[PDB]
Structure formats: structure tokens, C-alpha cells
Symmetry: C2
Subunit: 323 residues, 2 copies
């Protein structure tokens, strides 16, 4: 099932505060991911002229989020991830109305199909060439999957994140998670993995893997929340950037200190990882002839949680705010 | 704080003499005889309505531990208790018929019954024997609730339809649940949770404002899962049998866990028991937070927050020995 990734040794993992229980692997082409991050940084500055994104001491976020992706596709998905981070950081700092407008106008640039002329502010107008250029690169590698991925970057993320009204006050984990799925862009992320692995999941495929994706989606999102809480909380105080984080929700609705809320979220995460293993075991026990691409998918999502956990445990993006 | 008025605590030895495992304290409405009389009234009316039914042998709220309505409505005065107990028993009897019907005809029967309770008078049935039977079945309870509280009775009946009868069962293909999330969205409709709390509001003569609902959302999150999954835990054996022997749908979180985690029945039940005890502790933590954050919380909202916890415990306790679940 493994082709493009290599395992991180226990001896390396123990040097970090990682606590994931799932297997940690990294794309073998980490240098390609780093080059893609440098390209995104250069292009952002070239087109906008105005950061702590995927690069870290442990390796590039793209090499951990896309472990089983060949290098030409890794360069695309890493670049799109970094472009998304750079955009999202600005979005979190803007007034809700203007933040929403920037999200929607940015998302319209990713539509792979012809659109009638529309008005767009300076920021989206300056990024239009950037987005069309990367779409052409993706299409040249894989037309149908490239167009699908770009369509979902909008439909799964930019068109929905932020909701449509005032900034909500989260009074339940259920309501938090509905908002956070949109805000995290989870419905854009899995299509990027599909593009990276050159497999389009069928509707029937998605139905079969739903029991695995249930704990996986919560785990991947709440793993970011766990590791990014300190920096998000600091930023919210220091400049008003919006704090969207399950640790914060637990702090509030359970009257818990930061450390008590973190301890609770850690237990949720480890339990979700073990639940994923049980849901996955059940799929194997009940599908003796599972197609190879679906076997690959259900295995890859587990290492994707593990790898993004591992990266987040040390990344400058989450930890450089206080040395 | 002393918030109890119409209920009394159940004795520790009585509790230990049952398979109950709720971690929350157990109380019962002091007017159990009123609840039992309401159940018998529902059985009589349903028997007049239904050809060839179980009549007086249907297994609904009456038990040796007490009446389900006395446990589900512990803080309700006797006049209102008779109303909500009757409507709950009628709902159970109707739902048992629904569960035994093919899916689409069951849905149709679910919408038609809900229309009887719609204050907006939509979906009128065509006149005839069927319509006359349904009109007779519900006529007295419709008058009685309005005569005791017009404002809250109209609201309660509107939600008996809108929360439950109008939505339970969905439409189209019967689902094959592949996640607890998907299950719970369907189960909230099928259980009628959005009809149940309005009945409690009617019983306690208190309408929760929109503000009130936002404030208690952190408490209602674990409470709603607990009340529904508590029924699922205790009713699995009957529902599993009915699905196998008679082809009824199986709508039960124990079954979802059993399937999607490839567990034995006993392992699936144990997993759900752990979910339940954890939800009860979570309710306590959420409730403590509300009190810490709202020193001036209104008395009616404190009562509501405490009542929902005893409602989970009491319906758990009843279900641990209830004949419906154990001698069906
Ligand atoms: C908003 C999410 N993200 C990182 C996942 C910024 C933090 C960009 C992104 C969005 C959607 C898919 C992939 C990356
Ligand atoms: C919906 C079926 N029920 C739910 C408790 C028995 C499980 C009766 C009922 C119907 C409508 C409102 C409240 C209860
Ligand atoms: Mg964000
Ligand atoms: Mg952010
Ligand atoms: Mg974050
Ligand atoms: Mg039912
Ligand atoms: Mg039933
Ligand atoms: Mg049941």
C-alpha cells in the first residue's frame, strides 16, 4: 500500500511531544514540498507585495499531509495548501463582512469552468493569474482530477467557510463542528488527496468508507485545534484574529482551564484514533475482496492524521509565538 | 438548591434491586395513580380505534417500578400529568403500529396522525370511516389540553406534529446507517425529541425563550443523546428480534455500533453503556459551568436544567425493568 512514503522511526518521534497512536510516515520527496512552499511564498509576494506556513524542522506539512502522492502532484497540492494558509491567515484577521467577501471572491477564481464577468476587489484581481496558472499545471498532469480538485477548493471550502451571518458563539461541540468543517475546508482537503493519489472515489466508495471517515474527520480537525490553540489564543488577544478551536469551546462550555481543556481534547483524539482502527478492522472483516484503491484510501487517511499530528507537534507555525 | 415539588426520590435499596446503571439521581412523580389511569385511558381508546390489537395487553407505560409518565414527567402537576402521560402512551401505541408497517405506508400513517394535531389545519383528510376513527381517537385530548393551557397546548400539539410525526422516517430508501452521526440525525426525528421537550414545557407551564435555549444548549447536547441512547440500550433486544422475525426496521445505536465496529452484541452494549455514563458526567460538567457563569439564572431555567437530568435517570430506571423491554 506504501509507494511514495517512508516511516519515521520511533527514535525520531520520541524527540517530539507527539502523542498520536497511528503510524507516522513522510513523503520521500520532502525537498519537492519545500520547493513548492518557497514558490508559494515568492508568488504571494510577487502578486500581492504585502510567514510561518508549511516548513518545519521535521519536514514540510505537504510531505506529511500528502504522504502517498508522487512528486509532480505533490508540488501542486503543497503549493495549494500554502496558498490556502496564506489566504486564510489574512481572512481570520479581517472584519467578518470583508473576510467573507474575500473568501467568496478568491473561491470564484478556482472555478474550472467559464464564468460571466464579475466585479472583484484588488486582492482577488491580483491573484487571478496565479490561480489560473496553477490550474493549468494541475490539468496538464490530470485533467479530470485537476478540474475536480479546483472545483472543490471553492465548493468545499471558500464558498462555505464563515457561514453567512454574524460570527457565531459556540454552545455545543455539535454546532462547533458543523461550522469548523466548513472553516477547515475538510470537503476541499479530501479531493486534494484524491487528486494526489489519482483516484476518484465513487459514491458507493464514499458510502463504504463513511464509518472510517467519521472518526478521521474529527481527528484531523481537532488535531490542528489541539496544537494550534496556544497561537490562536495569543493572536486573538493581541490583534483580534478569530479564534475557532474546540479547545476554546471546551474551556467555555465546561468551565475548564486551558490545561484541563487540553487534557480533555487529548483524550478525545486518542479515542478517535483507536475508534478509526476499530472501524477499519470492521471494514476488512466484512469485505474480503475490498478494491485495492479503497484499501489504500482507508490506510492513507490514518497516516495522514498521524503525520499532520506529528508535524503540528513541533511546527514553527504553532510554536514560534513563544520560544 | 431546592427545586423539587411534584416528585419524590426513589429509595437506594429499590434502585440497587434493579439492573439500572444510571449515575444520576432517580425521582418519580408523586401522582403515579394519575399516570396509570391515563395509560389505561389510552389503552381503551386505542383498542376502540384498532381492529384486532392487543387491547389491554399492549406493553406500554405501566410497570411495577411505576408509570413511565411519572418518570418522564417528574415535575408536572397531576392535571397536566394526565395529559402528557396519555399523549405519550397514544404516541407509543401509534409508533408500535408504524414500526410494524411497510415503510412508505408507515410514513403516510405518520403524516396523517400528525395532521390531527396541527393547529394550522393543513392536510385535511377526506371524510369517511378512516377519518371518523381518527377524529374520535384524539377529540378529547385536544379539548383537554387547550382547556388547561391554550398557549402551551397549541404549542405542544404543533410540535407533536412538527417535531415528530411530520418528520419521522424521512422519505425514500430506508437508511443503512454507516456512522453514529448519520444515525443520530435520523433518530432524533424517529424518537420525536423535538416533540418531547415541548411536552415537558407544557407539563411544567414554562416556555423556554430563544435566549434560554442558547444558554442551555451545552446541557441539552449530552442530555438529548443520553435520553435517546438510553432507550436504545434497553430496547435493543426487542427491536433486534422484531427486525429479524418480522422485518421491522432496526433503529438503535447498539445495532449501529455492532455493525460498524464488528462487535458482538455484548461488546456493542458495553460500548453504549460507556457512552451513556460519560454523557451523564458530561451533563454534570456542563451544568456546573452554566451555574458558574450565571449567578442570577432565573428559577425556571435552574429547574429545567435539573429536571432534564432526572428525566434521563428516571426513564433509564423505568427501562431497566420495564416489561415492554424485558417481557415483550
Ligand atoms: C483553511 C485550511 N487551510 C489548511 C488546510 C488553511 C489552514 C488551507 C486549506 C484549505 C482547504 C484544503 C487544503 C488547505
Ligand atoms: C416518538 C415515540 N415515543 C418517543 C418517546 C416513544 C419512544 C413516544 C413519543 C412521541 C412523541 C413525543 C414524545 C414521545
Ligand atoms: Mg482558519
Ligand atoms: Mg488559522
Ligand atoms: Mg488551527
Ligand atoms: Mg419507534
Ligand atoms: Mg418502538
Ligand atoms: Mg427503542
Amino acid at each position: 500500500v506504501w509507494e511514495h512514503s517512508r516511516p519515521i522511526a520511533d527514535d525520531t518521534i520520541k524527540k517530539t511531544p507527539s502523542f498520536t497512536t497511528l503510524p507516522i510516515r513522510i513523503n520521500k520527496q520532502n525537498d519537492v514540498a519545500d520547493a513548492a512552499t518557497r514558490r508559494a511564498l515568492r508568488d504571494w509576494d510577487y502578486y500581492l507585495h504585502d510567514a510561518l506556513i508549511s516548513i518545519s524542522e521535521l519536514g514540510n506539512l505537504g510531505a506529511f499531509a500528502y504522504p502517498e502522492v508522487p512528486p509532480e502532484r505533490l508540488a501542486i497540492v503543497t503549493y495549494l495548501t500554502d496558498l490556502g494558509i496564506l489566504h486564510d491567515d489574512g481572512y481570520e484577521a479581517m472584519d467578518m463582512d470583508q473576510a467573507r467577501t474575500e473568501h467568496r471572491e478568491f473561491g470564484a477564481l478556482f472555478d474550472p469552468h467559464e464564468q460571466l464577468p464579475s466585479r472583484r476587489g484588488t486582492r482577488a484581481a491580483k491573484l487571478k493569474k496565479l490561480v489560473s496558472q496553477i490550474l493549468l499545471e494541475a490539468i496538464r498532469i490530470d485533467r479530470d482530477m485537476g478540474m475536480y480538485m479546483f472545483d472543490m477548493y471553492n465548493k468545499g471550502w471558500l464558498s462555505v467557510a464563515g457561514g453567512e451571518g454574524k460570527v457565531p458563539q459556540f454552545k455545543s461541540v455539535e454546532e462547533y463542528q458543523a461550522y469548523r468543517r466548513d472553516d477547515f475546508g475538510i470537503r476541499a482537503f479530501w479531493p486534494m488527496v484524491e487528486f494526489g493519489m489519482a483516484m476518484r472515489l465513487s459514491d458507493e466508495d464514499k458510502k463504504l468508507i463513511e464509518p472510517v471517515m467519521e472518526p478521521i474527520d474529527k481527528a484531523i480537525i481537532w488535531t490542528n485545534d489541539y496544537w494550534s490553540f496556544d497561537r490562536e489564543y495569543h493572536e486573538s488577544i493581541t490583534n483580534g484574529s478569530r479564534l475557532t478551536n474546540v479547545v476554546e469551546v471546551v474551556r467555555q462550555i465546561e468551565n475548564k482551564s486551558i490545561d484541563e481543556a487540553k487534557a480533555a481534547v487529548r483524550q478525545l483524539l486518542v479515542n478517535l484514533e483507536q475508534q478509526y482502527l476499530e472501524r477499519k478492522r470492521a471494514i476488512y472483516a466484512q469485505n474480503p475482496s475490498i478494491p485495492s484503491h479503497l484499501r489504500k484510501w482507508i490506510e492513507v487517511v490514518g497516516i495522514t492524521v498521524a503525520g499532520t499530528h506529528f508535524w503540528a507537534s513541533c511546527s514553527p507555525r504553532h510554536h514560534a509565538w513563544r520560544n
